[model samples]
Target: METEEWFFKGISRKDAERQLLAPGNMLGSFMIRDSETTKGSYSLSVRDYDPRQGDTVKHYKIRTLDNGGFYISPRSTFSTLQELVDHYKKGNDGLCQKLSVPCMSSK
Candidate 1:
């Protein structure tokens, strides 16, 4: 998963949001940012559409279960972060929308 360009370490929540909501990003564009609140956890940032708010960005926490696996929801758990991302990449499953292209870093 080291080759997953979508995963950005040291990216703050606000910056992740900015990137996802940037001009070039579209609905379902997303990025995985390292969690600032908890160790061993990460945050999934997804751009979505809302009738009331139009375009918006949603955040979901990726946490580890007691079984030593990671999951955004209890219904689905993955052995590796890559697996989790790949699963969601295929279907939103539980996210605001299915993950689309990764928010390319401008830096």
Candidate 2:
């Protein structure tokens, strides 16, 4: 019953996150910077440009959804991105996951 409602929402968000995270699929650029605010996290930034239109940019924030797991300063145990965002936006909860960013750049 109640659990069913979460079922749809769950995959929808993972799909959404997967959708936007794909580099080949991205129309413009949703780039990210290494986190100065938090270790092992990065802030997401977007730059949309067009020949007939001007450029638009946005900035936001990363991940811990690895090995079938999630992290607090990392991934969300909550299920979806909307749920993840809403919970974390209150100043504490969990942020986005790791799919959008490469796990390492040191190599």
Candidate 3:
């Protein structure tokens, strides 16, 4: 049971990672420049934007989930958008397998 818990946790983390790495996803923009950060890792960042009505500009930073790391500006912070996209593209299969869920073909 303990082993299964760990296994499921790992699978959940991978699923979360895939969700973050999906194209058109908020995190997707960050993936374009910080692909290396995603490999079995987690991170945190503050997204700043004007809360006032009619505000049109917003900014965000990608920081180390733990200790402080280098930050990125308005632009996405991953190595490349393609990197995140690719990770999701590859991870989808593993994710489904881990969860014993059917792939897109199930649809």
Candidate 4:
């Protein structure tokens, strides 16, 4: 299954299919502003999974980038790839809220 059109930008639906929505690899990147002054961005990672490898088991680890500070979330699982991505994005917001940190808005 695939997501809605609003999830992507620049690329056309046909081009996205041939380039981004290809068979094997998945998309993962941070969503941020085009400008350099942006303070915070949402880090995203996504991939496809086979049901045979225990659909409910997904593992993740978070490490600090450049600096020594770090924040980690517990291991989690979901029934589908979209579900996993949604959980990760939503969970990130909760984490930011707990730490009193602000995240970059979609706008």
Q: Pick the TM-score winner.
A: 1
Candidate 1 per-residue C-alpha lDDT over 1-107 given as tens digits, one digit per residue, 9 for 90 to 100 = 33458888868989888877778888878888787767677888888888997987888888887877788787878888888888888988987678878776565
Q: Give per-model TM-scores.
A: 0.87, 0.28, 0.17, 0.22
lDDT of 3 by residue, 1-107 (tens): 32111111223334534534434334212212222335544332111124475212121223442343333333333454334334434443222211111111111
Poorest lDDT segment (10 consecutive residues) of candidate 1? 1-10
Clashes of each: 0, 2, 12, 0
Kindly state the number of residue pairs that clash in model 2: 2
**Per-residue CA lDDT of candidate 4, range 4-64, in tens?**
3223333332343343234432333222111122323222222224558621212233333
Ranking by TM-score: 1, 2, 4, 3
Instruction: Judge candidate 2 against the unseen true structure and give its global Cα lDDT, from 0 to 1.
Output: 0.38
Arrange candidates by lDDT, descending.
1, 2, 4, 3
Q: Write out the backbone clash pairs for model 1.
A: none
CA RMSD per model (angstroms)? 2.4, 13.1, 15.1, 15.5
Against the correct fold, how does model 4 do in TM-score? 0.22
lDDT of each: 0.81, 0.38, 0.29, 0.32
Report lDDT (Cα) of residue 66, candidate 1.
Answer: 80
- Candidate 4 colliding pairs: none
> Which numbered prediction scores highest in lDDT against the true structure?
1
